[PDB]
Amino acid sequence: LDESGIVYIGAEVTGGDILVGKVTPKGETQLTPEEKLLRAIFGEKASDVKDSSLRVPNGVSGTVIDVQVFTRDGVEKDKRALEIEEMQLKQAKKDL
Amino acid sequence: LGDLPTSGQIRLYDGRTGEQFERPVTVGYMYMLKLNHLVDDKMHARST
């Protein structure tokens, strides 16, 4: 993954690999006292988010050759979409 | 014109033993196609 949470172009991937990282709110949960005590003993903290990343389906491999990012008008663009639009602008600039 | 037999059949030899096949065999060139029915997309199994 890059700094934006998106896999690099040209990476070789197989089943189970993460392509786009995403987290979701999770809310309240119920745990048995034994598992809670084990978690406390191991020292890991409790988190308020749940992994909902986009993963490669099982039985599928291949190379990443293209990535497209779409954003809402109100939302501000992230770095990678900026790079894509700079590439497009460069192509148009050469053509002109 | 191509210095080839006019019957279209030649003698062949078995690669595994080197013995000659008893009758002439028609040998030539034909255009072949690969269809969109791949075993990669058709094999499937399920346990539970």
Binding site: - | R11, Y13, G15, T26, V27, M32, K34, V39, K42, M43
Partner: protein
Amino acid sequence: KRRIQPGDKMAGRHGNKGVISKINPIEDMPYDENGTPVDIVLNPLGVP
């Protein structure tokens, strides 16, 4: 990329279709007087 393997479907332009059954080593293929082998072997029984 997908490479051919047993189970794939091949066909010509004359309604002759079939499924690949085996990939044969080069030294096991029939060869002619000059030693050049053949690429594909088909059953002559289908034609008549």
